[PDB]
């Protein structure tokens, strides 16, 4: 028996962190590309899956 795929899961980084908000999200931009470089990671996974 072998694993082959794992469940494809993408997670919006911008909502998870700042949910349903704005004046939260403005802070989230001061951290740079984290959110945008995460979804890249979790995509690279979910693509090769």
């Amino acid at each position: 028996i072998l694993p082959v795929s794992m469940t494809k899961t993408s997670v919006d980084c911008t909502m998870y962190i700042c949910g349903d908000s704005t004046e939260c999200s403005n802070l989230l931009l001061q951290y740079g590309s984290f959110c945008t470089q995460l979804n890249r990671a979790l995509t690279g996974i979910a693509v090769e899956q």
Binding site: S10, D12, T14, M15, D20, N39, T43
Partner: protein, 49 residues
């Protein structure tokens, strides 16, 4: 960026040339309508009279 979907891509990829294949761009989050406040009926009246 906002003209239309195709031109959101180019703003994600930082490219005018965009090759084939599905890209994620943004996240549409249905925005609420108004509000609901719901509390029991008054339960009591402080002996004002």
């Amino acid at each position: 960026c906002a003209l239309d979907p195709l031109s959101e891509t180019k703003c994600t990829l930082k490219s005018f040339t965009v090759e084939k294949g599905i890209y994620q761009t943004s996240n549409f989050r249905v925005q609420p309508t108004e509000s609901i406040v719901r509390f029991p009926n008054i339960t009591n009246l402080c002996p004002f009279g």
